[PDB]
């Protein structure tokens, strides 16, 4: 009954000459006493996968079948299905990444898949849930209550601009914003208008429209105080700053931002902080680990896991590919080239 990991496996990594590589003799991680061992069934592709520690495993989003259980783990059994996030390309843990045949759960940044979800649907969620939570925390917005019967009331609407309303992150975030009593207003391309509205946007606009920031300022009564930038380029930053109200506001982006007097505070989400383990980027010093960041991730996942279970948080629309590891490599290229719109690339792994 003791579990012994396989001697080697296939995983996706980067080699010594900056090329994405299928490695067929990759190591298998050891099983922590407080984690479970996962035979990965599906993975999702994220832009951050495509942005190096050679030979460390790639990939964030996984869903799979529990094949072994740590001695200190309760409430999980062999055969259970789980989904969660890995901390990709981490030099201290190069044998942990979503793009492997076998991984281990990390922290408490995971949950059991609800009976009603498939592996493919569940794999689509982890980075979205994680990022949505970090963005709400940085904006100074409370996470939803999983136990409440309706959102908090605001007789005077509290708007949140979401620049890039068709992004995988925005569609999960806008649902959470709604649950917490906020009213998201989104910008994206016309063909994704229905998607954005279905995911919680009160109104949606084409970001290309002339003088759109004036339109938004007027809509929000010149008091927009929250802007979430899911695109993070020179144009999106300029736009969000122009839309924020006359008295100031808070800009949060999902990436570090390029190079005002506008009374705007600023932050950006650092993905590895969902684990509270720290980060070696950005130099100098990166970030330390912290128990408060760790506890926030666990709390977020306990809340989001229930919301997913209850059908209150739905996955981004899926583009599913049946395949193996070369299909992940291929998926990453489609994503890197900006070739996906309003969909998440998920690969369902064939064994063998
Ligand atoms: N730091 C982190 O841990 C972290 C986590 C999650 C995401 N991110 C970052 O957030 C960004 C979005 O990632 P995601 O996975 O949420 O989204 P995604 O699904 O890859 O977003 C794709 C959408 O972005 C829109 N888009 C692309 N370029 C645009 C531009 N120049 N102006 C306006 N819209 C543009 C398009 O929407 P339309 O076709 O509708 O125009 C496209 O469909 C990426 O840069 C990613 O690196 C970072």
Curated annotation (Swiss-Prot):
SUPFAM superfamilies: GroES-like, NAD(P)-binding Rossmann-fold domains. CDD domains: enoyl_reductase_like (cd08249). It comes from the Eukaryota. Keywords: NADP, Nucleotide-binding, Oxidoreductase, Transferase. NADP(+) binds at residues 48-51, 166-169, 189-192, 207, 254-255, 269, 340-341. InterPro entries: ADH-like_N (IPR013154), GroES-like_sf (IPR011032), NAD(P)-bd_dom_sf (IPR036291), PKS_ER (IPR020843), Trans-enoyl_RdTase-like (IPR047122). One of its GO terms (biological process) is lovastatin biosynthetic process. SMART domains: PKS_ER. Disulfide bonds: none annotated. Changing residue 261 to I: Impairs the binding to lovB. Trans-enoyl reductase; part of the gene cluster that mediates the biosynthesis of lovastatin (also known as mevinolin, mevacor or monacolin K), a hypolipidemic inhibitor of (3S)-hydroxymethylglutaryl-coenzyme A (HMG-CoA) reductase (HMGR). The first step in the biosynthesis of lovastatin is the production of dihydromonacolin L acid (DML) by the lovastatin nonaketide synthase lovB and the trans-acting enoyl reductase lovC (called the lovB-lovC megasynthase complex) via condensation of one acetyl-CoA unit and 8 malonyl-CoA units. This is Lovastatin nonaketide synthase, enoyl reductase component lovC. It comes from Aspergillus terreus.
